[PDB]
Amino acid sequence: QYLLIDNQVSAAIKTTRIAEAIASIQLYVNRALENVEENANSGVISRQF
C-alpha cells in the first residue's frame, strides 16, 4: 500500500514496466481520492481528470 507494488506476488507473475507503473499510480489515486492516505489536496481532487 505504500510502495505501490506487491511484494507477496509469486515469481510466475509477469508484467511490463510501463504497465506496472500504471498500476502503481492507479493504486495511488484510489488511495488518495478515498482519503485513506491523509491530506490530499482538495484542489487537485476537484479537477476534471
Binding site: Y2, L3, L4, I5, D6, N7, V9, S10, A11, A12, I13, K14, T15, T16, R17, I18, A19, E20, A21, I22, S24, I25, Q26, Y28, V29, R31, A32, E37, E38, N39, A40, N41, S42, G43, V44, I45, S46, R47, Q48, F49
Partner: protein
C-alpha cells in the same frame, strides 16, 4: 485564458481570491474551459485531415486545408506528418500516453513535504524511460519489486552495490525475517534440486560423516550461518543485557513482550503465537493453553518483570 483550464475551479478561486470576486473568477473559468475545448477541436481537425489512411482513398474528397497544416508543423516540428501504428509507444493513445496523463495529474495529490508524495515514495517513476522496450518486454513483477527494495536499502545503508546489501542481510539480527544469507539459500536449494530427498548423501555415508548433523539440518531446514550463531549462543542471566541488544537492537523488552508486537515482529499467525506464548489477552485474566502458562509477574517494589513458565502434565485421567 491560459493555464486556467487544467486547474480545477477551486484551485483557480484560491489564486484569484485576493484580486477578483467570485463572479469574476467564475466568468474567466468557463471562458478558459471553452477555449480548451476549442483548442482540442482545432488540434484534432488538423490531425484528422492529415491522416495518411484518408489521403490515399481519393473518393472521400476530404480536402485538407494546407494553411493550418503548415503552421501546425512549424510549431510542432512536423508532428502532423508523423503517424504511428497502433501499439507504438509514441502514440497519443498508447499506455505510455495514458501513464503520462496519469502521472501528470496524480503527482500533485499530496504536498512535496508529505511522506505520501508520489516522488517521495517512488523516486524511480520520474526517471523511467517511455521506450518501446518498457512497454513491450515482460519481466517478473517480483523482480521489479526486489529491485525497488534493494535501491532504497542501498541508499539508506550507503552501500556500494547489491552484493554488499546481501552481505549485511546475512548478518543482520534485529528483524523477524533476517538473517537472510542469500548465497546460503542458493546453496541449499541447488542441493534440494540436484538431490531431491537427500538420498545420494545418505547412500554415501562417508561424505555425510564429514559434516556434522547440525549442518545437515541446514540443508532441508533453512538455518543460515548467522541463525546458527543465534541458536547456539549461551544465555546466562549475566550476559542477557548485552546479548539482548545484539539480537533485538533498540526494541524495549516491555514493548517486545506483548503479544501483538510479537505477532508482527516474527510475522506469526494468531494460532502460531499461542503455541509459544499462549492465550493472552488485554484484560486481567490469562489461561493455560497446550498445558502451559506464561505469565509476567511484575515485582511491585523493583518494577522488575519476572516471567514464569509453568508446564502441566496429567499423570492421571485428564477427563
Amino acid at each position: 485564458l491560459t493555464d486556467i483550464s487544467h486547474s480545477s475551479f477551486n484551485e483557480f478561486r484560491q489564486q484569484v481570491s485576493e484580486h477578483l470576486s467570485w463572479s469574476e473568477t467564475h466568468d474567466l473559468y468557463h471562458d478558459a474551459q471553452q477555449a480548451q475545448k476549442d483548442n482540442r477541436l482545432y488540434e484534432a481537425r488538423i490531425l484528422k485531415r492529415a491522416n495518411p489512411q484518408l489521403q490515399n482513398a481519393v473518393h472521400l474528397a476530404i480536402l485538407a486545408p494546407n494553411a493550418e497544416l503548415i503552421g501546425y508543423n512549424n510549431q510542432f516540428s512536423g508532428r502532423a506528418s508523423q503517424y504511428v501504428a497502433p501499439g507504438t509507444v509514441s502514440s497519443m493513445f498508447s499506455p505510455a500516453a495514458y501513464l503520462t496523463e496519469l502521472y501528470r495529474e496524480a503527482r500533485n495529490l499530496h504536498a512535496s513535504d508529505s511522506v505520501y508524495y508520489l516522488d517521495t515514495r517512488r523516486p524511480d517513476l520520474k526517471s523511467m524511460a517511455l521506450s518501446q522496450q518498457n512497454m513491450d518486454i515482460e519481466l517478473s513483477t517480483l523482480s521489479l519489486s526486489n529491485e525497488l527494495l534493494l535501491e532504497s536499502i542501498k541508499t539508506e545503508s550507503k552501500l556500494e552495490n547489491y552484493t554488499k546489501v546481501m552481505e549485511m542481510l546475512s548478518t543482520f539480527r534485529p528483524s523477524g525475517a533476517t538473517p537472510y544469507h542469500d548465497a546460503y539459500e542458493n546453496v541449499r536449494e541447488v542441493i534440494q534440486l540436484q538431490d531431491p530427498g537427500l538420498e545420494q548423501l545418505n547412500a554415501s555415508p562417508a561424505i555425510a560423516g564429514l559434516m556434522h548433523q547440525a549442518s545437515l539440518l541446514g540443508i532441508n531446514a533453512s538455518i543460515s550461518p548467522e541463525l546458527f550463531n543465534i541458536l547456539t549462543e549461551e544465555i546466562t542471566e549475566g550476559n542477557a543485557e548485552e546479548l539482548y541488544k545484539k539480537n533485538f537492537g533498540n526494541i524495549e523488552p516491555a514493548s517486545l513482550a506483548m503479544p501483538e508486537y510479537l505477532k508482527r515482529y516474527y510475522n506469526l499467525s494468531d494460532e502460531e503465537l499461542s503455541q509459544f506464548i499462549g492465550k493472552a489477552s488485554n484484560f486481567g485474566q490469562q489461561e493455560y493453553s497446550n498445558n502451559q502458562l506464561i505469565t509476567p509477574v511484575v515485582n511491585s517494589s523493583d518494577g522488575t518483570v519476572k516471567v514464569y513458565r509453568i508446564t502441566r502434565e496429567y499423570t492421571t485421567n485428564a477427563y
